[PDB]
Design a protein around this nucleic acid. Sequence first.
RNA 1: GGCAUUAAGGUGGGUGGAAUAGUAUAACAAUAUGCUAAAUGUUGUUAUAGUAUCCCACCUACCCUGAUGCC
Length: 236
Amino acid sequence: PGPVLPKNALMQLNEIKPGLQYMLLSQTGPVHAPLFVMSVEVNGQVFEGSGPTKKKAKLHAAEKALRSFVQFPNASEAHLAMGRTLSVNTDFTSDQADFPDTLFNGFETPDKSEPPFYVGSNGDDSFSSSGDVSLSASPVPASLTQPPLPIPPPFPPPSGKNPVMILNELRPGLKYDFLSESGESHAKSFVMSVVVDGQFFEGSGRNKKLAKARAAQSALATVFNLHLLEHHHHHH
RNA sequence: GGCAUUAAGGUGGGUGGAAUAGUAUAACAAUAUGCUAAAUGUUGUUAUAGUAUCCCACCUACCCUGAUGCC
């Protein structure tokens, strides 16, 4: 239907509030996933809530203490004739609200190019199947819109710019890999590859920096629908 | 065969610099709940800071290749 807001628990607490008290426990963790546990006290009942940042913590705390407090807005008696326990009858289930979507078929080109389409006496294994794999990605199919190579066509490397950061600051939502060399310590030719939005790029060089500058340059221009050698003053 | 000097490239480590990210602290205003009043909440603007992510430069060590000289 739509989103929700804490203003409910906030207003409601503000109403019931006879003069309550908020506490802040924990508050420790990494620099980007800190945990705060705020505990809220009314009439001697305290309820603790664990959220990132103080907002959600105090919120959940307020909710709990609200629901408890509405049953003890005042007191004059107590007992011990009650308690609580645990269970394990929930380690399994019999219902859901979602479904799988994984692959179930796949194929590979039977030859260096597409097979005939006007004959029936030049083979015996290209008209009696439609797939042979569903658990791998080793095939090398095509789309008649780009060469069948595992890589896009060649591109010119940079000569003073550095596309690794531009890309890693316009769309850092990628991953990179590094690939083999071709010498002992001289005439070396290392390479890097990348995967970006699902596409794949690669680039070689005399060192790891130059190789990433070519693989990145390729990834940037293609995925950003832009280029790197057609301007030089877009900013200053 | 060993030794000296000179030069090119690559790799590891250390140091320094920059950008991005989330959180936190502090100030100001507005908006909301009550408006008897108090208090609190929500949002906006501004300033500051440990860290994490990533890059760049410098320094050092190592590896390797070229050139020349001596024995």
